[PDB]
Design a protein around this ligand. Sequence first.
Ligand SMILES: N[C@H](CCC(=O)N[C@@H](CS)C(=O)NCC(=O)O)C(=O)O
Ligand SMILES: N[C@H](CCC(=O)N[C@@H](CS)C(=O)NCC(=O)O)C(=O)O
Lengths: 208, 208
Amino acid sequence: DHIKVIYFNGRGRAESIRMTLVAAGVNYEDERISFQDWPKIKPTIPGGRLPAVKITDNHGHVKWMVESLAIARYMAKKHHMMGGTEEEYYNVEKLIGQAEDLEHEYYKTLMKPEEEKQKIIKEILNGKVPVLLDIICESLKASTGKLAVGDKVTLADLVLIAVIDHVTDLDKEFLTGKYPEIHKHRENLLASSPRLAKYLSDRAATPF
Amino acid sequence: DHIKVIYFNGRGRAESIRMTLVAAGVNYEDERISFQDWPKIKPTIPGGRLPAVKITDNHGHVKWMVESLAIARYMAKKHHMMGGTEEEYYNVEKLIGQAEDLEHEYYKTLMKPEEEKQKIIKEILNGKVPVLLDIICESLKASTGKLAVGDKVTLADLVLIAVIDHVTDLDKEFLTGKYPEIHKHRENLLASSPRLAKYLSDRAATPF
Ligand SMILES: N[C@H](CCC(=O)N[C@@H](CS)C(=O)NCC(=O)O)C(=O)O
Ligand SMILES: N[C@H](CCC(=O)N[C@@H](CS)C(=O)NCC(=O)O)C(=O)O
């Protein structure tokens, strides 16, 4: 099967899909669309939004997938990364929901003409961001393993590390000297996943 | 088992949990905390945030759950409401992610001193809301059954109808004469679920 991930030049919503595939060891073609070329590409995409995933068979079948975390979860479910039990399933999802809350705090800073961007960053770094980082810390503390849930990689590991990269985009020292469970989590994750470690070292710094 | 759902006086984040339980036919105690009483209740809640679910055994065990859609999904997974296949699982999640996008549009209108509330409602009803309602329409159209995914209730049915109630909170006629797949979906859902129909008729109108 040929797997094509279609997104813009960045981490953004596609990141959970790429990391899932990378961690799973699944090869894919990583297609980035420029903002200039997007007007002509948009009509060729079912739903006209990105990220979109196009999966092609060696027998001519073509499957289109949209909705990033639905794709990530389906892929994660395929490669045993959503929990081995109901309880682990719950905990994966708990950490994902918490990580997404924080992502939505990060979203508030986008499409902002600066100045009010800065005024928002302050609002959130002084408000909900620390609250959420702490809740995430507690979610990690309650694990029986080195990682988010047990000792094996799950989608929760991947979604977490992408969201932290967004926090550090707003304030690079925000986690320095604090939240030891999150630093340690990243450390354990990269140790557990040489593929994800190499992938992370080959990005390709992007503004989002 | 005794199941206690703890939230504020409203639909909000707890709604997906209540509906899941109701649809599943699972009895629970529905605890609403007043804003006046919240300061004293907050420290007794693991993580200090709501919704929280407290499950008690007939053998003294006490299980605390937080993170609404993680709880809803776990419960939905228990009662066969997350898909019977990987493909159905994907489609449940696709519709949930789309419904949550729209919920986040709705969130933008909250905590707003009016006036700017109205200015936002206009922004979103003229921008992303119609885009999302249409995408949801396409997700429903691609189902092989009367409901979101097949003919049986899944968490996607429940999350959708709660999000539409929030859209109609902003503008009650926004879907009048439009989006036939969404009206029909609600119609099929209530037909398929007498329990959810009765539950919906016994709310208890709330501001959120
Ligand atoms: N629920 C999101 C929605 C994706 C989304 O907001 N797409 C944006 C880019 S990040 C987009 O396609 N906007 C450009 C357009 O609508 O034409 C997902 O994770 O898939
Ligand atoms: N990810 C959300 C977070 C819940 C949340 O934002 N809780 C709010 C009420 S809707 C809250 O507990 N705020 C009051 C407080 O933090 O003390 C969930 O679905 O559980």
